[PDB]
Scaffold this active site. Structure first.
Site, PDB file in Angstrom:
ATOM      1  N   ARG A  16       0.822  -1.180   0.000  1.00  0.00           N
ATOM      2  CA  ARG A  16       0.000   0.000   0.000  1.00  0.00           C
ATOM      3  C   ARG A  16       0.861   1.236   0.000  1.00  0.00           C
ATOM      4  NH1 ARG A  16      -4.550  -1.489   4.641  1.00  0.00           N
ATOM      5  NH2 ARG A  16      -5.443  -3.295   3.545  1.00  0.00           N
ATOM      6  N   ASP A  17       1.982   1.193   0.699  1.00  0.00           N
ATOM      7  CA  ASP A  17       2.787   2.393   0.818  1.00  0.00           C
ATOM      8  C   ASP A  17       3.971   2.469  -0.089  1.00  0.00           C
ATOM      9  OD1 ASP A  17       1.439   1.689   3.418  1.00  0.00           O
ATOM     10  OD2 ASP A  17       2.292   3.632   3.983  1.00  0.00           O
ATOM     11  N   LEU A  18       3.957   3.352  -1.093  1.00  0.00           N
ATOM     12  CA  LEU A  18       5.206   3.455  -1.828  1.00  0.00           C
ATOM     13  C   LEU A  18       5.742   4.867  -1.698  1.00  0.00           C
ATOM     14  CD1 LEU A  18       6.886   1.546  -2.817  1.00  0.00           C
ATOM     15  CD2 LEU A  18       5.857   1.604  -5.076  1.00  0.00           C
TER      16      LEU A  18
END
Ligand SMILES: Nc1ncnc2c1ncn2[C@@H]1O[C@H](COP(=O)(O)OP(=O)(O)O)[C@@H](O)[C@H]1O
Ligand SMILES: Nc1ncnc2c1ncn2[C@@H]1O[C@H](COP(=O)(O)OP(=O)(O)O)[C@@H](O)[C@H]1O
Lengths: 633, 253, 234, 632
Positions: C57-59
């Site tokens: 989800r986190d880039l």
């Protein structure tokens, strides 16, 4: 309307041709199948004996004998297993795809100890791979000697034999084709039995005929081929080290015993036991792209299935020599490869886990660990380079020289203990040889300040350290990089600032004259007794690293040519040389001497830092200019 | 014969899945994470359902019990009607739990075998070794003179490694040289001075010669043209010392 | 005295991983073409992740490691060393504003823990003119609010393949390029151009070899119509 | 006495299981078998059409379609080949191991053109690997539409179908086991038909259903098999245009091949072949252990096996090609050859033909330049490995030399330019051209006008160490002990005189500089530098040793032990060593001379391609002399 149902039927003639020709890749397996089948028969009669010793009255011993006969081109395998009744002979041997063994087992009470080999009921016909006319003579209890004979045609003949009573058992007589006569010589035989089916439970006794007739020797000589019992089946805590050792020597002809031995088992849908040995010394041809990749040999119910599949164990663990044995695996019809390969992957995971454990356990015997590590250290670093998960658990197995430790490697942790409450990093320097890095220019500041350093002196290192970014939350930094910030006092900091204020010009004009080589030049912080040194840019390739790459033989040439490394030159501000240099510079600019001196010391520093000069000839000529002057030519 | 069970197995660490842009390590630790998450998620689903079905059949029971209590009572079977309706749709919702309970089983069926589910370690045990002559077949390897024959012939045995076999070659070359046939003495002394050659060359490796046996004999496929280089001269040169030893020996018979 | 040692060992390639993009970006700025190239690298990686079903989800720019080729172009690698779908797309849109030197808007603007979290409309800082118009249109279309209009990873990567490697011609424009499997070889010919057009970085060849293969006409044709519609200014 | 003869019988139940479970290794092959069988059917009716047009009256299309219906989990392969009459349905499909195809072939006249894929007869049953129930609906001329149907149990049911007539042909419908729904999607399919069977003759047209609801692609035909097999066509009838197209199709590439070989052998082993050399080397060559060969073996147009190491020795990875035969002993699974020595004969024929393509390419100087600067490493590697072709490999080499600037030349051009007395080829190994060019060793030769060769590649040493001879003229490195070049007798006696003058100087230098060098002697190859270091004749050379130590995975002991023994030479006419002999014979054991010897020795060791063990001492000496000259 009408649906008519019919049952599947088979064209026996073509079917048998199929079985004979297309199934088995190699022709020599036929010896395995007859042996295996004969072993099954032995197990049946042995089981029967336990309940009723009346059965074993006919014949006591249970052996398997192979009797090659060169004269009549007949190789006969004789076993003393349960034989076949007339009905059995017709039904079992006669019908393709029927296996008596499977029936015996199913009928048997559940949980019975006996584990028999074959289930497919098609293996026996393989004898036709090397024979045109097979003749089976069997005699079993409650029936007379009978003799099945077949020539691979649609027909098989069963006749009551009236020859010498063979007692309980089966004699299978082969007649070899003109080709495949190779099997007759004892050499090929002995070799084959050693390859497959070495660990069947029973004594295989070859009967070769040699005639001297000169003290005549070896008229007939029983060379019991299968000698070493399978150990791994036995339970641990019953196997002294010596016994394990004997197995090692046999498994891999070696004059001296193993170094360490792991032995374990897993129960589940995948059931498999295992032996793992670490040799005392490395083999000469490890990492020589030799055909052999892994040494562990897979076994099923004790018949050698397949070896040297890469998937079994990763490359870094190639040295581990071992025997894996399971009781049931989805097997290809030829019985030479697993049906699906992911089973091998689960095996691999369990293996590497256990092996790594064997290792970290060995860390206790400092002496033994010294031997093992100085032997197979390369493999561990290689693993660090490749294995992603075990990387962390691999790290601790490392051992290094350091500034502090003298002539005694230490782990990374011992260095973590001896940290100075402010280190926040591990200091390591990569080089070619210990002494050289030991006296290097970079380390001098640290050794003065007492911070410890690590000597990575191996070509393989860089491959490892470049991925070994962290350890126990304390990072690694090479000393040969641009920043090198070590813990200091504020007064030292303002003093260094003062140095920069004093020398800022000198760096400028040196950059000017010595152009096209260095990006920039700056007052150093890690030098205390040498005038100057070269550190590479933080992101770019370190000098040593480059040296390694340019050397690798199969390097991509174009990339290497495109490659360039940024250079930054540091100067040691308190050195007398650079002091007088700033004097001569601020005195007069663009003097010839300061130019040449600068080139000279830059060259010599580039030399000392490990980087190699593009053309030594200019430097040598400069030296000669100087020598001539001294000699007063 | 059936292999259906081995059809579906799932392994996080697979070489095939890697893509040049994605880092292998983080990919693996992501896949493993996803598998662990999914398996624990399905197990939590299974346990939560295992509760729900149980407590709904429990509700079936309590409805029964208290309705039976009112069944005995006078004039209260209107409550019997209402709660029997509640209980009938409760029973259908319980059969729904059953339905997905059977789906749970189907998920178990589809649950791909992973390293943990497939196998549970049984036993393990590690040990660390702490530990610090056939003369006629010497004559046979000797008679050959082609050190391939003699190479695998002495690789027949571990005893070849022992100093004693080397010591015996000394004995046998000595007493052969005075057996009234000089030819066979050097037809083995090629092996003897090859013994010493590989002795000092494996010492140029500083490896026990025993190791360097196979390293030297089949060094390269050509094997220095069966090692034509320097074997005769050096052997007749060692045959000098063998002759002295032999001649003194024959004086002692 | 004349013993031998000419064995050939295994060859191992070495990869420096010196920095995370955030860093390499503050120390160096890339040319527009190379920037489009690395953006393509990211799109390909994110797709591949979408396929395996694992979605980070986190880039963030700190996550993406940069492999500095020796004196060579950077090769991007996604990683999670720093601790649904189309979220990654929105993230990579924002990574891009950075690659061109415009500091990330949402790292400070708002609504970054979820792309669904509505940022203020059009406050998106207009991109510099150094970017080609199509890429600009792309990042705008990608950072749009709804995932519905948000094009999937593969669509975007195909858009970049067309623009950068493929020909830049009028047939190429305005949807004159009638989709075809034969056109896939036409796409190769379109990729024949650009092989040596800007050979200052070796990565062009590499990517061409490693990604040109798995090119699928349907996604390609969707990318083509989207590429036209923008350029078409229809 | 009495002999009772019985006949083999088979447990059909167990046999069936063996076939479905144990025989075939990869599940996906089932798509190959069904396709192959249908191709055979197609070939039959084509043949039959030749004789009589009436046979093809029903339909003339001759095509294969694969309609995956996700909706009902049924993949159906439809063909237009001669179908099966009832009797055939029962006999052929029913009985295991009965091959109608084999029978048809046997019946045909000896010279019949048709080649049909299978004869084993167990293939159809492979469909059961992915299907619970296989329904075959076939109509053939001379019979009504029937419908076989079986569930892999012991029974099959045959019933006249009254559905839509499908003209002539056959349609096999599958019902996939739920766990294998993956095969239904277009992606996996398309991938499969390409890998196996992308060269079958007839058109394979997939029918995927899509809704563009605007609406479109309701049923789109995507003809997967598109490229035609070229190698079957006659060589010399194919221009270099189509050769390229096939190549790009074979290996996804944006540019065309570089050169193309194409040939065929008709002996006991009948096989044709295509061989291409790519324009640019693959970026991953030599880096991936898994892929060793790029040639893909084919039998009767179906992909059998690839990447088997035996096919071509490993220093030929760049070669990209296709081998196709008409008959080989094949494993039942049809995924590996039964005899493997056949692959060996194939390998021999291959390498022979390839080395020809290359020595043929030597003509186009330009093209050869491109190819060589691209794949030169492979040739040297072969020199290192291939024992026989070593000789024929050599000529393909090209090198810089003293006489040729920016223009590599073969070893032959050098054999021609050999002055009458050469008797050897002079080569120097180093790290970069310029460096070796200005080296100390070559100076004498360049003065005498001889030509020398610059081997500047790490891979070289591996080659040159085995490339002992060439055309009867040997090779000698200049950095060895006994560089004996043709001279005049007066030069010899003069050198002898030099030795008489300098014999003592060598002695005492050996004394002071002890245990670093084995011997010092008046040089013969120096003319402008004071001194240089050459290694012992048998030991390792300088950079060879360097490269070896720099190798990533190397046995430490062996590397250290097999090493150079250094010998220092001095140039007798140099002014430096002259004044040195003066100062020496004047006074022994002077401090200055001692240091001088060790300083110039260090600098020579540096300029000899060797690396000093510790640069720090040398750097400190330099700093000392700097301070002295600067009067600090
Ligand atoms: N030496 C033997 N003694 C007794 N029975 C045998 C012997 N060899 C084969 N048989 C019987 O004949 C059957 C033929 O089986 P076979 O074709 O060998 O397949 P499998 O390897 O599964 O046994 C066997 O199941 C076994 O019951
Ligand atoms: N689609 C089809 N159309 C017509 N005949 C077929 C078809 N498929 C199979 N057959 C016939 O049924 C027989 C079954 O053979 P098979 O099991 O496929 O083995 P093989 O691959 O050797 O033909 C074949 O010999 C062929 O004659």
């Amino acid at each position: 309307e009408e649906v008519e149902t019919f049952a599947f039927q088979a064209e026996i003639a073509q079917l048998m041709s199929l079985i004979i020709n297309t199934f088995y890749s190699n022709k020599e397996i036929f010896l395995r199948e007859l042996i295996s089948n004969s072993s099954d028969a032995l197990d049946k009669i042995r089981y029967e004996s336990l309940t009723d010793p009346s059965k074993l009255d006919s014949g006591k011993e249970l052996h398997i004998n192979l009797i090659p006969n060169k004269q009549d081109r007949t190789l006969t395998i004789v076993d003393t297993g349960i034989g076949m009744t007339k009905a059995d002979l017709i039904n079992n041997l006669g019908t393709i795809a029927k296996s008596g063994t499977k029936a015996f087992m199913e009928a048997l009470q559940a949980g019975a100890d006996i584990s028999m080999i074959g289930q497919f009921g098609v293996g026996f016909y393989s004898a036709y791979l090397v024979a045109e006319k097979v003749t089976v003579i069997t005699k079993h209890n409650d029936d007379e000697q009978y003799a099945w004979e077949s020539s691979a045609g649609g027909s098989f003949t069963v006749r009551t034999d009236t020859g010498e009573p063979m007692g309980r058992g089966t004699k299978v007589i082969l007649h070899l084709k003109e080709d495949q006569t190779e099997y007759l010589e004892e050499r090929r035989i002995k070799e084959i039995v050693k390859k497959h089916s070495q660990f069947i439970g029973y004594p295989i006794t070859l009967f070769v005929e040699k005639e001297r007739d000169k003290i005549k020797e070896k008229y007939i000589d029983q060379e019991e081929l299968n000698k070493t019992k399978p150990i791994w089946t036995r339970n641990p805590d019953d196997i002294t080290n010596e016994e394990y050792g004997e197995f090692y020597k046999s498994l891999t002809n070696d004059w001296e015993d193993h170094l360490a031995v792991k032995h374990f088992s897993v129960e589940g849908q995948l059931e498999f036991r295992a032996l793992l040995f670490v040799p005392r010394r490395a083999p000469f041809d490890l990492f020589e792209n030799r055909k052999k990749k892994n040494n562990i040999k897979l076994y099923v119910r004790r018949v050698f299935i397949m070896d040297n599949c890469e998937e079994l164990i990763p490359e870094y663990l190639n040295f581990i020599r071992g025997v894996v044995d399971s009781e049931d695996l989805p097997l290809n019809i030829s019985r030479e490869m697993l049906q699906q390969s992911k089973i091998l992957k689960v095996i691999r995971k369990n293996l590497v886990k256990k092996c790594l454990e064997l290792f970290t356990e060995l860390a206790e015997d400092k002496e033994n660990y010294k031997k093992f590590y100085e032997q197979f250290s390369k493999n561990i670093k290689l693993g660090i380079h490749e294995d992603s998960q075990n990387r962390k658990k691999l790290s601790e197995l490392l051992r290094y020289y350091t500034s502090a430790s003298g002539d005694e490697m230490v782990s990374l942790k011992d260095y973590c203990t001896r940290m100075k409450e402010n280190q926040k990093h591990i200091y390591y320097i990569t080089g070619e040889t210990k002494d050289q890095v030991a006296n290097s220019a970079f380390v001098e500041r640290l050794r003065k300040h007492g911070l410890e350093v690590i000597y990575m002196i191996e070509p393989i290192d860089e491959y490892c350290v470049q991925q070994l970014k962290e350890f126990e939350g304390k990072t690694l930094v090479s000393v040969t990089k641009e920043g090198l910030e070590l813990p200091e006092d504020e007064e030292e900091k303002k003093k260094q600032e003062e140095k920069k204020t004093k020398f800022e010009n000198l760096c400028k004009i040196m950059k000017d004259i010595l152009e096209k080589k260095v990006e920039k030049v700056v007052v150093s912080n890690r030098l205390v007794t040498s005038p100057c040194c070269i550190v590479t840019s933080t992101y770019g390739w370190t000098a040593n690293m480059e040296r390694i790459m340019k050397a690798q033989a199969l390097r991509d040439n174009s990339t290497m040519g495109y490659m360039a490394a940024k250079k930054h030159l540091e100067i040691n501000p308190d050195h007398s040389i650079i002091e007088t240099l700033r004097q001569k510079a601020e005195a007069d600019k663009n003097d010839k001497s300061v130019k040449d001196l600068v080139i000279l010391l830059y060259e010599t520093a580039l030399l000392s830092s490990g980087f190699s000069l593009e053309d030594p000839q200019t430097h040598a000529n400069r030296i000669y200019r100087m020598i001539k002057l001294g000699l007063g030519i | 014969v059936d292999y259906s069970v081995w059809d579906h197995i799932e392994v996080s660490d697979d070489e095939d899945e890697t893509h040049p842009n994605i880092d292998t390590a983080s990919l693996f630790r992501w896949r493993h994470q996803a598998r662990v998450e999914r398996m624990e998620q399905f197990q939590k689903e299974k346990e939560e359902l295992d509760r729900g079905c149980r407590e709904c059949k429990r509700k079936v029971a309590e409805c029964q019990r208290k309705l039976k209590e009112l069944e005995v009572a006078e004039g209260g079977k209107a409550e019997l009607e209402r709660l029997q309706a509640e209980a009938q749709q409760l029973r259908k919702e319980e059969r729904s739990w059953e339905q997905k309970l059977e789906e749970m089983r189907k998920k178990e069926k589809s649950m791909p075998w992973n390293v943990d589910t497939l196998s549970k370690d049984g036993f393990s045990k590690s040990m660390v070794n702490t530990k610090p002559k056939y003369e006629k077949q010497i004559k046979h390897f000797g008679m050959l003179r082609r050190w391939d024959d003699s190479q695998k012939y002495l690789s027949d045995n571990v005893h070849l490694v022992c100093e004693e076999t080397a010591n015996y070659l000394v004995i046998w070359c000595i007493d052969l040289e005075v057996e009234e046939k000089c030819a066979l003495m050097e037809q083995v002394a090629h092996q003897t001075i090859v013994m010493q050659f590989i002795l000092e060359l494996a010492k140029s490796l500083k490896v026990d010669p025993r190791a360097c046996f196979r390293q030297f004999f089949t060094k390269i496929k050509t094997a220095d043209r069966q090692y034509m280089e320097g074997f005769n001269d050096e052997l007749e040169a060692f045959k000098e010392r063998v002759r002295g030893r032999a001649k003194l020996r024959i004086e002692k018979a | 005295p004349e013993g031998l040692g000419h064995g050939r060992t295994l060859f191992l390639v070495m990869k420096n991983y010196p920095c995370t993009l955030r860093q390499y970006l503050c120390v160096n700025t890339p040319s527009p073409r190379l920037a489009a190239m690395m953006l393509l690298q990211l799109l390909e990686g994110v797709d591949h992740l979408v396929q395996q079903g694992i979605a980070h989800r986190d880039l963030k720019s700190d996550n993406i490691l940069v492999e500095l080729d020796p004196d060579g172009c950077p090769w991007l690698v996604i990683a999670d060393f720093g601790c649904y779908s189309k979220a990654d797309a929105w993230a990579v849109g924002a990574i891009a504003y950075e690659i061109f030197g415009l500091v990330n808007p949402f790292y400070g603007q708002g609504k970054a823990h979820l792309e669904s979290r509505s940022y203020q409309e059009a406050q998106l800082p207009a991109l510099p003119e150094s970017v080609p118009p199509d890429v600009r249109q792309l990042v705008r279309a990608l950072l749009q609010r709804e995932a519905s209009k948000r094009p999937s990873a593969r669509v975007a990567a195909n858009v970049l393949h067309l623009s950068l490697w493929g020909e830049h011609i009028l047939a190429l424009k305005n949807l004159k390029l009638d989709k075809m499997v034969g056109w896939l070889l036409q796409q190769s010919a379109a990729t024949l151009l650009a092989n040596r057009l800007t050979e200052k970085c070796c990565v062009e060849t590499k990517m061409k070899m490693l990604f040109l293969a798995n090119l699928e006409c349907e996604t390609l044709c969707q990318a083509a119509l989207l590429l036209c519609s923008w350029r078409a200014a229809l």
